[PDB]
Amino acid sequence: IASASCTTXICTCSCSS
Amino acid sequence: IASASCTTXICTCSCSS
Secondary structure (H helix, E strand, O other): OOOOOOOOOOOOOOOOO | OOOOOOOOOOOOOOOOO
């Protein structure tokens, strides 16, 4: 439901460091 | 055809930094 870099269907994932 | 964080169909996108 939230995070960065880390799912399959909604929208986050990853994206920096 | 390659990168990180940045396309729609093949497989990269983003994910670290």
